Structure 1
């Protein structure tokens, strides 16, 4: 039904780790959530599940990862994210970078170049800009930075209570 938590993730690299450390912990504070695993590849956009999700979902939490440049499906997802955000700024974005530098989002260099260069031999000549623009417009909004060294856990604590706050009082 109506819930306020839509997510995202990399594929094999971190989806399982995040489900183990954040998703449950969230469920322990009484908030219905959402996500899934399937890869389709029989087309590009699943209808009233992907779309019911983005539509009714409220405050997004896109855990960008150090591989978040390979999945065309993931690239088109965060897109519609930033799109249906820019309509009525009462729903808010909460980015949480991971391992990969927050210096590599305001211009896409470093670990992404081999990804895009081969990704650019394939798809459109235009829409790729409406993706690049969105991946631009996160590296400014606020951001828990969790490096590879700081305690990769109880930051879960610090990060849940907040998502509670923006709901309890309003």
Structure 2
């Protein structure tokens, strides 16, 4: 059905980083969902790890479902690391750890560890949000044909 499923905490990214990503995707004719069982129906899951991704249960459970569609459906998963250390996502250490379960639990740690290591986009390695989002759209678009 869909080209992309986005998993993100709205408070961190919806009005800003996400709007730019979705605009670039749209302009490349990438398909997604305009606001949980839709994940199955999506070829690519773009996961936006932000500072408060670890505070939402809907986020984490969305991620577990994304992880299941990786292992069972060969859903491709692209993690974005948005002002968030990727090692802290993988190891639930530091700031991101603290937020993690101030908030089952082991299925979560398994998803975070699994997706954190995949080929992704670390804003800290990129000159700008605009350029990173550009590369991400071309990677999704050639990942979709």
TM-score, with length taken from structure 1: 0.77
1:60 to 29, 45, 49: 45
Post-superposition offset of 1:118: 2.9
- Alignment-derived partner of residue 40 in structure 1: none
CA distance in 1, matches of 2:61, 2:135: 30
Could you tell me whether the CA contact under 8 Å between 1:98 and 1:148 is conserved in 2?
Answer: no
TM-score (normalizing by structure 2):
0.89
- Structure 2 residue matching 1:27: 3-state secondary structure: helix
The 3-state SS of whatever aligns with 1:4 is: strand
Q: Is the 8 A contact 1:99 1:148 kept in 2?
A: no
Partner residue in 1 for 2:27: 28
Residue correspondence of structure 1 range 46-125 to structure 2 within 5 A: 50-51=36-37, 53-89=38-74, 91-119=75-103
Q: Deviations over 1:79-131 (max 9, x none)?
A: 11101221143x31111111111221221111134324432xxxxxxx11111
Aligned residues: 145
Listed as ranges, the gaps of 5+ residues in structure 1 are: 37-49, 120-126
Distance 1:82 1:141 in 2: 12
Unaligned runs of 5+ in 2: none
Give the structure with the larger strand fraction. 2
**2:144 equivalent to 1:157:** no
Higher relative helix content:
2
Deviations 1:45-69 (A, max 9, x none): xxxxx21x11211111001111111
Equivalent position of 1:43 in the other structure: none
Shift in alpha-carbon separation, 1:112–1:6, aligned structure 2, 3 A: same
Higher-Rg structure is 1
